[PDB]
């Protein structure tokens, strides 16, 4: 109706505020501070320094591993976030895992842009900031992991979305009817339609200065799926060629069902 949309939107936004320890506003308040600045990692010296306060494998592999720790935590938060999206809990458990299974990485990269600026990104729960040049100085193929995400982030951040916009966007990413193997594809479809509808109305209302934001945001979902398959391919390549580089068991299984 009209109160049903406020209801849908509000419940989704509160879930977002509840379940994600880190969000765009909080990351911005840090990249600007002061409330204890973020330790900077721009070289091996500071990297080891930062690790000693935030294994014994090669540097590149230790980072590969920490990025995975971040993903695992985000997958957990996304699951709790999803259970709160109106109608998600009513879905069959198999449909819930299928949705989470096929949509966590799109959601992860959609949200990672929040902690990134053109010079680097926030790590260690906000207490650290790693340099983009440093990530690029890493041995190949490890230096190829983050750079593409920075390319995406700069274009995504150019849209200037705030957390309320992002919470709706992530909800739309998760409640996808295209995911293979869905049981009640019809209900999920109704959810998707309602979420995309309120997202668009919310954008027009939250961003009156850019009436073309909705379409530009939708183009991003497209670039995200692309970024993800490219990411998944690089992770497989690294795990397969680099003997010390391993894949966390949960992430290994998620990657198995995506393709
Ligand atoms: C390379 C593994 O990629 C992850 C996705 C990912 C990628 C990057 C990412 O970036 C988080 C930022 C970060 C950068 C460095 C880091 O290491 S450190 C040693 O500086 O703490 C920790 C987090 C989060 C998830 C996967 O496939 O699950
Ligand atoms: Na249909």
UniProtKB/Swiss-Prot annotation:
The keyword Hydrolase does not apply. Induction: Down-regulated by aging. Its main location: nucleus. Indeglitazar binds at residues 71, 105, 255. Residues 95-224 are annotated as: Required for heterodimerization with RXRA. GO terms for cellular component: chromatin; nucleoplasm; nucleus. One of its GO terms (molecular function) is DNA binding. GO terms for biological process: behavioral response to nicotine; cell differentiation; cellular response to fructose stimulus; cellular response to starvation; circadian regulation of gene expression; enamel mineralization; epidermis development; fatty acid metabolic process. Residues 39-257 form the NR LBD domain. Skeletal muscle, liver, heart and kidney. Expressed in monocytes. It is found in: Nucleus. Ubiquitinated by E3 ubiquitin-protein ligase HUWE1; leading to proteasomal degradation. The keyword Metal-binding applies. The record marks 224 as: Essential for heterodimerization with RXRA. Keywords: Activator, Biological rhythms, DNA-binding, Lipid-binding, Metal-binding, Nucleus, Receptor, Transcription, Transcription regulation, Ubl conjugation, Zinc, Zinc-finger. Heterodimer; with RXRA. This heterodimerization is required for DNA binding and transactivation activity. Interacts with NCOA3 coactivator. Interacts with CITED2; the interaction stimulates its transcriptional activity. Also interacts with PPARBP in vitro. Interacts with AKAP13, LPIN1, PRDM16 and coactivator NCOA6. Interacts with ASXL1 and ASXL2. Interacts with PER2. Interacts with SIRT1; the interaction seems to be modulated by NAD(+) levels. Interacts with CRY1 and CRY2. Ligand-activated transcription factor. Key regulator of lipid metabolism. Activated by the endogenous ligand 1-palmitoyl-2-oleoyl-sn-glycerol-3-phosphocholine (16:0/18:1-GPC). Activated by oleylethanolamide, a naturally occurring lipid that regulates satiety. Receptor for peroxisome proliferators such as hypolipidemic drugs and fatty acids. Regulates the peroxisomal beta-oxidation pathway of fatty acids. Functions as a transcription activator for the ACOX1 and P450 genes. Transactivation activity requires heterodimerization with RXRA and is antagonized by NR2C2. Belongs to the nuclear hormone receptor family. NR1 subfamily. This is Peroxisome proliferator-activated receptor alpha. It comes from Homo sapiens. The gene is PPARA.
């Amino acid at each position: 109706e009209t109160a049903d949309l406020k209801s849908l939107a509000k419940r989704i936004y509160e879930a977002y505020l509840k379940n994600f320890n880190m969000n765009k506003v909080k990351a911005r308040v840090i990249l600007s501070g002061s409330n204890n600045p973020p330790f900077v990692i721009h070289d091996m010296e500071t990297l080891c320094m930062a690790e000693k306060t935030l294994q014994n494998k090669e540097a590149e592999v230790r980072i590969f591993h920490c990025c995975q720790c971040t993903s695992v935590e985000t997958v957990t938060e996304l699951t709790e976030f999803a259970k709160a999206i109106p109608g998600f809990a009513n879905l069959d458990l198999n449909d819930q895992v299928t949705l989470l299974k096929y949509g966590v990485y799109e959601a992860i990269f959609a949200m990672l842009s929040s902690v990134m600026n053109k010079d680097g990104m926030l790590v260690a729960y906000g207490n650290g900031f790693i340099t983009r040049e440093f990530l690029k100085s890493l041995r190949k193929p490890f230096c190829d992991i983050m750079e593409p995400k920075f390319d995406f982030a700069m274009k995504f951040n150019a849209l200037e979305l705030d957390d309320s916009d992002i919470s709706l966007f992530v909800a739309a990413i998760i409640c996808c009817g295209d995911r293979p193997g869905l049981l009640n594809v019809g209900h999920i479809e109704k959810m998707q339609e309602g979420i995309v509808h309120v997202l668009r109305l919310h954008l027009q209302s939250n961003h009156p200065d850019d009436i073309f934001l909705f379409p530009k945001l939708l183009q991003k979902m497209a670039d995200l799926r692309q970024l993800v398959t490219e990411h998944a391919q690089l992770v497989q390549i690294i795990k397969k060629t680099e003997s010390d580089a391993a894949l966390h068991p949960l992430l290994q299984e998620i990657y198995r069902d995506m393709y």
